Amino acid sequence: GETTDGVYRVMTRRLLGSTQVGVGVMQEGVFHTMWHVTKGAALRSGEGRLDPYWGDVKQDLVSYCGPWKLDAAWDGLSEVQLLAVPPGERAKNIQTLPGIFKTKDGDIGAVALDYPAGTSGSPILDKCGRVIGLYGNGVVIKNGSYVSAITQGKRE
Amino acid sequence: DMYIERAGDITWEKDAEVTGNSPRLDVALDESGDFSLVE
Ligand SMILES: O=C1CCN(c2ccccn2)CC1
C-alpha cells in the first residue's frame, strides 16, 4: 500500500458508486482520522491492509498501524489553515483565525467553516505545516452556522 | 470495505483564501463524543 506522508480521502464502495466518508493524515507510517469516519473498521491501501491501533469515541479519534503521532498545538493567537479535502473536489487550503470552545475541562481552538460531511478528518495546520488537529467534530450555533473543534490526540 | 487514496501534501499555502469568524462558545462534551452548546 501507499505509505507516503500526506492527506488522504477515506472511501467506501458499500453505498451507491464510490462514496467519500472522510479524510485522514499519514505521518510517520501511521494513518490518523476521526473515529466517526471509520467507526474503527480496518482500511485498505491498494493491496495492503491498515488495522486500527488506538481509538477513543469521546475524543473522536483513531490511529492505524501505530500510536497517534500528531502533537502540535494551536498557539492560541495565530491564524491557521484548514486543508479541506471535500468529496469529488481538489484539496484546498483555507486560512482562518480560530475561535474557542470553553469547556469545564479547559479551552480548545475551534474553526468556523462548513463543508460536506465527508470532509471530516481534514487536517488543520500551523505556519510550519504541522498538523494541530483534525476538522469534523463540532456544534451548530444559534444562527445555524457550523463550528468544528480543532481535535488533537496525545502522542504517548 | 473502506479504502484510502492520496489527495495531497500537507503544507501551508502563502496567500490562501482567508475567511471564517472566531466565535467564543461555552460547550459541553458528552461520553459519546458529541459537543453541545451550554446556555
Ligand atoms: O465534516 C463535516 C461533518 C460535520 N458537518 C456539519 C454537521 C452539522 C451541520 C453542518 N455541518 C460539517 C462537515
Q: Per-domain residue ranges for chain A?
A: 6-64, 80-149
- Do the Cβ atoms of A69 and A30 come closer than 8 Å? yes
Q: First CA to last CA across chain A, in angstroms?
A: 26
Final resolution, Å: 1.4
Residue with cell 502522542: A155
* Of A42, A128, A141, Cβ closest to residue B25: A141
| A115 Cα: distance to centroid of ligand 1 (angstroms) | 6
* A127/A121 Cα distance (integer angstroms): 19
Q: Where does ligand 1 bind, in terms of residues with CB under 6 Å?
A: A 114-115, 117, 119-120, 136, 140, 146
State which approach was used to obtain the coordinates: X-ray
Query: Residue A103 burial (CB < 10 Å; 0-12/13-18/19+)?
Result: middle
Contact criterion met (CB < 8 Å) for A126 and B13: no
Residue with cell 481552538: A109
Burial A55-66 (b: 16+ CB within 10 A, else e): beeebbbbbbbe
- Do the Cβ atoms of B13 and A125 come closer than 8 Å? no
Q: Is A60 assigned a catalytic role? A: yes
CATH T-level assignment (fold) for domain A80-149: Thrombin, subunit H (2.40.10)
Q: Which of A83, A115, A141, A148 to mutate to test the interface with B (most CBs of B within 10 A)?
A: A83
Which one of the listed residues A60, A63, A122, A148 is annotated catalytic? A60
Angle at A136 between CA A131 and CA A141, to 5 degrees: 125
Compute the radius of gyration of chain B from its Cα atoms.
Answer: 17
C-alpha pair distances (Å), A129 with each of A41, A94, A106, A132: 29, 13, 25, 9
Q: Which residues pair with A22 in a beta bridge?
A: A10
Same CATH topology for A6-64 and A80-149: the answer is: yes
Domain A6-64 is of which CATH architecture?
A: Beta Barrel (2.40)
For residue A121, is it left (φ>0), alpha (ψ between -120 and 50) or beta? left
C-alpha pair distances (Å), B33 with each of A26, A28, A136: 23, 26, 12
- Ligand 1, atom 13, lies closest to the CA of A117
Which regions of A1-104 does DSSP assign to beta strands (E)? 6-12, 19-27, 30-33, 43-45, 48-50, 52-56, 61-64, 80-84, 92-96, 99-103
* A55/A112 Cα distance (integer angstroms): 26
